[PDB]
């Protein structure tokens with residue numbers, strides 16, 4: 001699907017995320033070319049599973065308290081695609097609660113940016 | 117152009133930015149579909165130049181202190197299209213010197229994201 005770019009309407013997609021620690025769940029994800037690494041909400045993980053601490057430099061600035069790192073790979077199924085994206089590791093937003101589909105995933109599903 | 121997406125490779129582009137308060141300048145800007153608004157470095161702006169305080173949410177959280185907002189429109193010339201993007205207002209990174217082409221800009225040159 002061509003997703004047109006509009007400052008007022010974020011380019012979002014419904015993606016099904018499998019964290020491998022609880023049941024797969026469909027969340028709203030933001031399609032993000034600025035993002036090196038895909039960001040999953042923590043509500044998709046069980047209480048038990050260990051998560052590595054990590055430091056992240058975003059527009060806000062430095063933060064060690066705010067994102068964690070996955071212990072296991074993550075599987076993302078898009079609405080159209082039958083085969084799952086597999087991400088060796090990705091960031092876990094701990095305090096907020098929506099996902100960012102970053103260039104790690106965008107590469108695996110032959111995603112591109114077109115400028116006429 | 118079709119811009120392929122690689123996690124190991126920030127999608128950057130050579131942009132010419134006229135802030136209207138100094139000589140126009142060429143910078144390397146990150147093509148970022150998760151940015152609502154364009155960010156450019158304060159290094160393009162003159163010593164006087166009134167800039168409005170602003171609040172901005174990013175990966176590091178909300179930041180009152182880091183970004184300012186332009187008083188005047190910003191002209192952006194890209195390599196291909198001869199005719200410029202005119203942004204009514206865009207963010208100015210004071211702390212670092214980030215260059216990010218957001219959706220405000222990408223819309224004005226009819227950028228789309230294509231997922232096969």
Ligand SMILES: C[C@@H](NC(=O)[C@H]1N(C(=O)[C@@H](O)[C@H](Cc2ccccc2)NC(=O)[C@@H](NC(=O)[C@@H](NC(=O)CN2CCOCC2)c2ccccc2)C(C)(C)C)CSC1(C)C)C(C)(C)C
Nearest residue numbers: 032034035036037057058059150151152153172173174175
């Ligand atoms: C390591 C990190 N990488 C990055 O963050 C890279 N960037 C990216 O990947 C960007 O796409 C980033 C994605 C993101 C949006 C909202 C929370 C957290 C991340 N976008 C922004 O940070 C941009 N922020 C924005 O566009 C924000 N807009 C506003 O702050 C203004 N309002 C709007 C509503 O909330 C109150 C303030 C925004 C608010 C809520 C949801 C989505 C956006 C911007 C400040 C750069 C203009 C910009 S800087 C970067 C390092 C190149 C990842 C966590 C994303 C992998």
Ligand SMILES: [Zn+2]
Nearest residue numbers: 063065066177
């Ligand atoms: Zn914090």
